[PDB]
Every structure is written in C-alpha cells, then in structure tokens.
Amino acid sequence: TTLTARPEAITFDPQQSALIVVDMQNAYATPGGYLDLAGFDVSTTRPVIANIQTAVTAARAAGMLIIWFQNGWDEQYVEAGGPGSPNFHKSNALKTMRKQPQLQGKLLAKGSWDYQLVDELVPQPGDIVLPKPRYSGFFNTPLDSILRSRGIRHLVFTGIATNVSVESTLRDGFFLEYFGVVLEDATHQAGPKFAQKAALFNIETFFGWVSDVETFCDALSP
Amino acid sequence: TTLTARPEAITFDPQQSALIVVDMQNAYATPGGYLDLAGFDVSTTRPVIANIQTAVTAARAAGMLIIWFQNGWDEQYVEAGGPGSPNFHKSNALKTMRKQPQLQGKLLAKGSWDYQLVDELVPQPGDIVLPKPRYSGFFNTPLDSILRSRGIRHLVFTGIATNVSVESTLRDGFFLEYFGVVLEDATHQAGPKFAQKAALFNIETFFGWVSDVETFCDALSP
Structure with missing residues (x-):
C-alpha cells in the first residue's frame, strides 16, 4: 500500500501494520467524562468517533491488527x-477528584463508565485491547512485544488526545524504530486548537506522517 | 527548596537534582548551523545562550549536577x-544534506563545527557530557542509569529544541518517574512560534513544570 501523506507519501504492508485507537473512552470523548469535568472541550468529538469507526472497518478488512488502548487505573489509584x-501531581483526573470528592474513584477507573470505550466503538474478537497506566502506550506495557512478535513496523494512529497520549505514543514509537502515521481527522486534542495544530506539525516535521481517514480507506481498498 | 512554577510551585533538593542542557550546539543555536540551513529561524538564540550560562552558574554553585547533551552521529551517519x-526518513539534517550535497558529512557529525557546543558554553570538570543519537535523551543512552545511580528525581531542562529534543526528553523522563521542569526563557523551538507555546502548554498541563531562569536562580540562592 502507498498512502498519500505529509510530508510525503509512504508505503506500508497492511498485514504487517497496526491501527491503534488511542483511548476512545468516555473519559476522553464524552460530555460528563473526565476531560469535560477537567475543563477541556469535548463537544466536537462526534466526527472523530465516526471517522474512527470508518477507519477500523477498512483496516480490519485489509488484515491490519486493531489495537485499542484504554487509559486508567484501579479505583484506589494504586496504579496511578x-x-x-x-x-x-500532573494527572488532571486526580486533580479533579481531589477538588471534587464526589468523583473520587470514578475518573479513569477500571470497570467504570468513565473508563469504558464510547458506545459506538466495540472491539471484535482477535483485536488487542491494552490497558495503559500512563500517557504513552509504549511505557509499562507489552505493546512493543506484541508488535515485534508480529513483525509490525508501521503504526497508524487515531484517538484522543492528539498532543498527549497519541503524540507521546507516536514519539516513543519513533524512538523504538516504528514508522508512525496519524490520521488527523480521527484525532482530537486536549487543549486549545493550537495544540492540535502543533501536534500534527511536530509529527509531520520530526517524527512521522500525517494523512486522513478518506485517504487511508482508499489506499487500503486493493 | 521551593521553585515557583506553572501550574504550581514544586519542592526539590538541588543536590538530588540535575540541570540538563539539551543540544546547545552550533547545529541548533548558531547562524549557518543545521537548523538555520534547514530553514528554521535561529535569529533569536543569543539571549537563550546567555540565560543558559546564568542557569548553569547557579546550578553548579548549588550542587546540582550539570548534564550536557550533544545530538549527532558518526560522519558516515551509520548511527543515524x-x-x-x-x-x-524524518531527519531534517539528512534531508538538507540530500538537497545540498556540499553539506554532506558536515551536519550533526562528530568532529564537525556543526556538532560542537557553541563557543560560549564550556563544560567544566564534574559535569557530564553525553552524546545522543535520537531526539530523546533517554533512548539509547545511559542517562537514566546516570541519574538513578545518584538518586536524582528532579530534572531542570534548558536548550534547543523546546518541542523536539527538550520536550521528548522531558516526556520520557515523566514516563520514567522523573519530575521535569523547563526554564522557558532558556529554550528555543524549531518551527513557528506556536511550537514554543504549544510545547510549554503540553509540559505545564500534562508532563511537568514551567519556570524561568530568574526564578530558578533566586530559588537556589539560599
């Protein structure tokens, strides 16, 4: 597959590539979830959810491994x-519960509504669902092992937030010699609009490649 | 000791802390170096050099370890x-030398002027000078081991580029349970000005703390 992308088109074999869906949980995408409660704007994630569902359909039909991350911890936050x-000290979820004790034990808590994947996105058998305890999916997890065990060198990134868990994972992938592509219209930032722009700029200029869902699905069709 | 910082002040022991000077090489700071030749703006880095000098002087007098990074490779670029x-495929120095063959072997090459630390910054006995082959100072190096061997948990970051080698090293430090502070007037971005603001926003909001050189030196004076 040759995928049109910035700063230039890349090539990848879908059967040795993975689609990673980063943290598409109510915490990161849904009114009333952690990010909303912490003061971030999640009001525009409807299209991101739909675009991810479209990208997953295409990726799976092409034989790409689907990996889903869920960020969070035990409800006592030992793992935080x-x-x-x-x-x-940095966790905005922990800060929110320290200010709002009614929420203690609910934000990013395994088994909870906040931690659940959004209703529209349902992993299928054969997909990999990985919990992670920190922003980057390459620290404290078996992600690198999983990918290496399948000979996967190309990672297509989607999810939330573009500038935090997405970009941190993509950057660490680059340091682990992975080729990372982000589908910009299947991401959303945590922060003002410049954080989306700056994340895609950093990725395109220094770390990886930027494309979009329509291009990705068209390239995969053969 | 207390350091006034965003988003809130922190406490640290300078003798269990390190000041990291990221890549203050002609490549990254000086007219006619790699970044300048690659089209990035380095017009404003002279105050950054001066501010790093001030911060280094204060850190050494307080007993903080000084670590200098040099980013680059053998002049045949095996290590790239x-x-x-x-x-x-991502390296902008390699891209620049492909477009301008008269620069081949001259950018980010060990033994080259480009690779040298700027004339104004001279490591002193007892400092550590570490080479690194990728943006993050934590991958492929002994940095984590050096810090752990001395019980260091707090890292104060300066240097270039705020959004690439600086932020990458700080983000990875966070994933290795280091408390990271960036001195904002002791850094400079590679890219448009928004890349500076966005790196500091990402650091302040998710990964660490932002302070400045005056606040840092005043904190260290007692």
Missing part, C-alpha cells in the same frame, strides 16, 4: 502512583 | 540509522 510519582 | 529506520 502516589506522591512519589510525577503522575500523581 | 539506514533506510530501515524512521530517523533516516
């Missing part, structure tokens, strides 16, 4: 790190 | 990775 971890 | 590596 206590005060000795910077994550305890 | 061949065509099997995404670095070979």
Whole structure:
C-alpha cells in the first residue's frame, strides 16, 4: 500500500501494520467524562468517533491488527502512583477528584463508565485491547512485544488526545524504530486548537506522517 | 527548596537534582548551523545562550549536577540509522544534506563545527557530557542509569529544541518517574512560534513544570 501523506507519501504492508485507537473512552470523548469535568472541550468529538469507526472497518478488512488502548487505573489509584510519582501531581483526573470528592474513584477507573470505550466503538474478537497506566502506550506495557512478535513496523494512529497520549505514543514509537502515521481527522486534542495544530506539525516535521481517514480507506481498498 | 512554577510551585533538593542542557550546539543555536540551513529561524538564540550560562552558574554553585547533551552521529551517519529506520526518513539534517550535497558529512557529525557546543558554553570538570543519537535523551543512552545511580528525581531542562529534543526528553523522563521542569526563557523551538507555546502548554498541563531562569536562580540562592 502507498498512502498519500505529509510530508510525503509512504508505503506500508497492511498485514504487517497496526491501527491503534488511542483511548476512545468516555473519559476522553464524552460530555460528563473526565476531560469535560477537567475543563477541556469535548463537544466536537462526534466526527472523530465516526471517522474512527470508518477507519477500523477498512483496516480490519485489509488484515491490519486493531489495537485499542484504554487509559486508567484501579479505583484506589494504586496504579496511578502516589506522591512519589510525577503522575500523581500532573494527572488532571486526580486533580479533579481531589477538588471534587464526589468523583473520587470514578475518573479513569477500571470497570467504570468513565473508563469504558464510547458506545459506538466495540472491539471484535482477535483485536488487542491494552490497558495503559500512563500517557504513552509504549511505557509499562507489552505493546512493543506484541508488535515485534508480529513483525509490525508501521503504526497508524487515531484517538484522543492528539498532543498527549497519541503524540507521546507516536514519539516513543519513533524512538523504538516504528514508522508512525496519524490520521488527523480521527484525532482530537486536549487543549486549545493550537495544540492540535502543533501536534500534527511536530509529527509531520520530526517524527512521522500525517494523512486522513478518506485517504487511508482508499489506499487500503486493493 | 521551593521553585515557583506553572501550574504550581514544586519542592526539590538541588543536590538530588540535575540541570540538563539539551543540544546547545552550533547545529541548533548558531547562524549557518543545521537548523538555520534547514530553514528554521535561529535569529533569536543569543539571549537563550546567555540565560543558559546564568542557569548553569547557579546550578553548579548549588550542587546540582550539570548534564550536557550533544545530538549527532558518526560522519558516515551509520548511527543515524539506514533506510530501515524512521530517523533516516524524518531527519531534517539528512534531508538538507540530500538537497545540498556540499553539506554532506558536515551536519550533526562528530568532529564537525556543526556538532560542537557553541563557543560560549564550556563544560567544566564534574559535569557530564553525553552524546545522543535520537531526539530523546533517554533512548539509547545511559542517562537514566546516570541519574538513578545518584538518586536524582528532579530534572531542570534548558536548550534547543523546546518541542523536539527538550520536550521528548522531558516526556520520557515523566514516563520514567522523573519530575521535569523547563526554564522557558532558556529554550528555543524549531518551527513557528506556536511550537514554543504549544510545547510549554503540553509540559505545564500534562508532563511537568514551567519556570524561568530568574526564578530558578533566586530559588537556589539560599
């Protein structure tokens, strides 16, 4: 497959590539979820959800491995790190529950509504569903092992947030010698609109490739 | 010690902390270096050099370890990775030398002027000078081991580029449970000005802390 992309077209074999859907959980995409409660704007994620469902259909039909990440922790937040971890101090979900004790134990908590994948996106048998405890899917997980075990070198990224969990995973992939592509219209940022722009700029200029869902699906059809 | 910072002040022991000077080489800071030749703006880096000098002087007097990074490779570029590596295809120095063959072997090459630290910044005995082959100082190097061996948990970052080698090293530090601070007036971005604001926003909001050189030196004075 040759995929039209910025800053130039790339090539990849779908059967040695994966589509990663980053954190399409109510926490990151749905009114009333963690990001909304923490002051971020999730009001425009409807199209991102639809575009991801379209990209998953195409990717799976082409034999690409589908990997779903769910970000979060046990409901006691042992896995988030206590005060000795910077994550305890940086986590906007932990900050929100420290200010709003009614929410304690609900944000990003395994088994909870916040942690659930959005209703529209349902993994199928044979897909990989990976929990992760930090923004990058390549730290503290078997992601690299899973991919290496299948000879996969090309990663197509979708999900939320473009500038945090998506970009962190793509950047770490580059340092692990993976070729990373992001489908811009299947992502959404956490922060002002410049965070989306800057994330795609950093990726295109230094780390990987940018394309979009329509291009991706058309390239996969043969 | 308290460091006033965004989004809130932190506490740290300077003697269990390190000041990291990222890639203050002619490549990244000086007219006629790689970034300039590649079309990035380095017109404004002279105050950044001066501010790094001030921060280094304060850190050393407080007993903070100083770590200098030099980014680059052998002059045949074996260490940049061949065509099997995404670095070979993303590297803007390689791209520039492909378009301008008179520059081949001259950018980011060990032994070259481009690769040298700027004349104004001179490592002192007791500092550590680390080479690195990729944007993140934590991949492919002994950096994590060096810091752990000395019980260092707090990293104060300066250098170029804010959004690439700086932010990448800080983000990976966070995933390795380091508390990272960037001194914003001691950094410069590679790209448009929005890339500076976006890196600082991402750091302040998700990965670490933002301060500045004056606040840092004042914090260290007692």
